[PDB]
C-alpha cells in the first residue's frame, strides 16, 4: 500500500 | 495522558469493523484484518486510516498485510508499538  | 489517538471514536475495534459496511468489492483485505491492525474505512476508495497515529493507507496490493503495511509506513505509531 501507499501512505495517503 | 501522554499519548492521544487521532480518532477516539474509533478507539473500539467493533466501531472500526462497522466502518467497513461499504468497503468496495475490489478491495481484497478483510475488514477483520484491517480493524485488528487499528484501521478503519475513510469512505473513499480503498483508503483506511489508523485511529491511533492517524496514518492513511490506500492502493493495497496482493500479498500486502494490514499490520506490516501499517508498521512499514508508520513505525512510531503507539498502536504498532503496543502490539
Ligand atoms: Zn497507526
Numbering used by the authors:
A (entry chain B): 1 to 4
B (entry chain A): 151 to 233
What does the paper say about this structure?
XIAP (X-linked inhibitor of apoptosis) directly inhibits the upstream caspase-9 and the downstream caspase-3 and caspase-7, and therefore controls critical apoptotic checkpoints. The XIAP protein consists of several domains, including three zinc-containing BIR (baculovirus IAP repeat) domains (BIR1, BIR2 and BIR3) and a C-terminal RING domain. The linker region blocks the active sites of these caspases, while the N-terminal regions of the partially processed caspase-3 and caspase-7 bind the BIR2 domain in a peptide-binding groove that accommodates the four N-­terminal residues. As has been reported previously for other BIR domains, the overall architecture of the BIR2 domain is a three-stranded antiparallel β-sheet surrounded by five α-helices, with a structurally important zinc residue coordinated by Cys200, Cys203, His220 and Cys227.
